[PDB]
Each structure stands twice: as structure tokens, then as C-alpha cells.
């Protein structure tokens, strides 16, 4: 039970990512119980930019494509408890390009999405934090904030 546009667009998105994706990144559809691929749920990995504290670590995410894709944006989710000010305690993020009420366009590719999630790691937004452990340190103790990010980078490596 999948629409003609969702299947066709997801098949093209995997065709583009297979042959041209940024270095250090990976993204593949997860497997069902019978072993076949689920094009509406992907496993991906975001490597931290070099020079930043996030360097050396590849952080996994989940990309869930809804039934209305690409009219509706996909949903990205870190593991629960991921340390970042704009990441919910459950692991959910909210980028403006992944918000249907904001800057989501049907022409946005997976390459642009994984690059947008990467740019959020080393550039949080203090105007809207989503958790407490990372928002406290980022707003009153930069020394310990960088300590956790340097530790979390060694965690996912």
C-alpha cells in the first residue's frame, strides 16, 4: 500500500544517493521482517565536521518518510538521549527545511537533508532549546558542554 509518487520518488532518491553522496555519510533503507527493504524508513549516519568538537564521530539517525512524501517532509530522529541543545529527549529534531509549515520543499534531496542535520550539530539555536541537559551547559558552562561533545564524538566512533 504505497502511492505511485512516493514509490517513484523514493526509488529516485536511493538512485541518486547510491552514486553521489557526501563523504563520510551513509544512508540505506532498513530491512523488514522478511528481509526486503523499507523505502519509507532509512538508517543514516552524520559525520562531524573536521576541526569542530564533533569531529571523528559518525552519529546515526533515522529518516522516516510519510505516506504523503514528498509533499510532506520526512522525520529525522537521533537516538534517545542524544546530547544537543535542539534535540528532544526522545531524539527528535526540527529543522526549518524539514517543517511542513516552514521551509520544506518537495525538491529537497536526502543529500541536502543530511547536510542540514550536520550543520545543526556545531551551530545550535539558543532561541528554542529542546532538551535540558544540553541547554543548561550551553547557556552557563561552555567548558563542560565541549567536554560532553568531545566525549560523545568518541562515543559514536
Amino acid at each position: 500500500h504505497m502511492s505511485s509518487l512516493s514509490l517513484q520518488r523514493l526509488q529516485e532518491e536511493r538512485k541518486k544517493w547510491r552514486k553521489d553522496h557526501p563523504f563520510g555519510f551513509y544512508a540505506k533503507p532498513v530491512k523488514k521482517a522478511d528481509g526486503s527493504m523499507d523505502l519509507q524508513k532509512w538508517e543514516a549516519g552524520i559525520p562531524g565536521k573536521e576541526g569542530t568538537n564533533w569531529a571523528g564521530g559518525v552519529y546515526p539517525i533515522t529518516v522516516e518518510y510519510p505516506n504523503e512524501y514528498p509533499s510532506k517532509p520526512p522525520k529525522v530522529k537521533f537516538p534517545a538521549g542524544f546530547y544537543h541543545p535542539n534535540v528532544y529527549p526522545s531524539g527528535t529534531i526540527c529543522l526549518s527545511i524539514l517543517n511542513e509549515d516552514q521551509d520544506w520543499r518537495p525538491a529537497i534531496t536526502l543529500k541536502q537533508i543530511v547536510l542540514g542535520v550536520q550543520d545543526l550539530l556545531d551551530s545550535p539555536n539558543p532561541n528554542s532549546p529542546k532538551q535540558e541537559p544540553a541547554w543548561r551547559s550551553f547557556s552557563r558552562n561552555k567548558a563542560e558542554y565541549d567536554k560532553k561533545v568531545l566525549l560523545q564524538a568518541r562515543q559514536y566512533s
Partner: protein, 79 residues
């Protein structure tokens, strides 16, 4: 040429080749690329060598050579 230079502005699908003088501000360069794509200039991130470009800078301020590529990305904000 030694007075003008050619630059390439791309977003991964459509791209436009320009030619301006090294002292011309890139503000005119960015507004042209965004207007020809139906977007607003304040909604795109133009990068050179992986670094954002201000509207006041010129090709000579960043030491741009010939046929250098300017990458246009979608502006975003987390929350």
C-alpha cells in the same frame, strides 16, 4: 582579461556562469542567481571553500581564481 573573472554558482541541479570584475560586490551576484530560481536572496547560503560569503565581499577579498565554484545551499534554522 585580468580585470574580470568567471564564476560558477550551483545548487546541485541548475547552475549559472557569470562574469564580473574582481572589485564588484557579490551582492549583485547572489541576488541574480536567487531571482532566476524563483527564490529570495535571504533564503540561500552561498559558500566559497566551505565558508559563508557576506554581501559586502568581493572576489578579490577572498582571492577567487578563474572558474571558481560558488555553492548555494538552503538557509535553515534548528529548534
Amino acid at each position: 582579461p585580468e580585470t574580470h573573472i568567471n564564476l560558477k554558482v550551483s545548487d546541485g541541479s541548475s547552475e549559472i556562469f557569470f562574469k564580473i570584475k574582481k572589485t564588484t560586490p557579490l551582492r549583485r551576484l547572489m541576488e541574480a542567481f536567487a531571482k532566476r530560481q524563483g527564490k529570495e536572496m535571504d533564503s540561500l547560503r552561498f559558500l566559497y571553500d566551505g565558508i559563508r560569503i557576506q554581501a559586502d565581499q568581493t572576489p578579490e577579498d577572498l582571492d577567487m581564481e578563474d572558474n571558481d565554484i560558488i555553492e548555494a545551499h538552503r538557509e535553515q534554522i534548528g529548534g
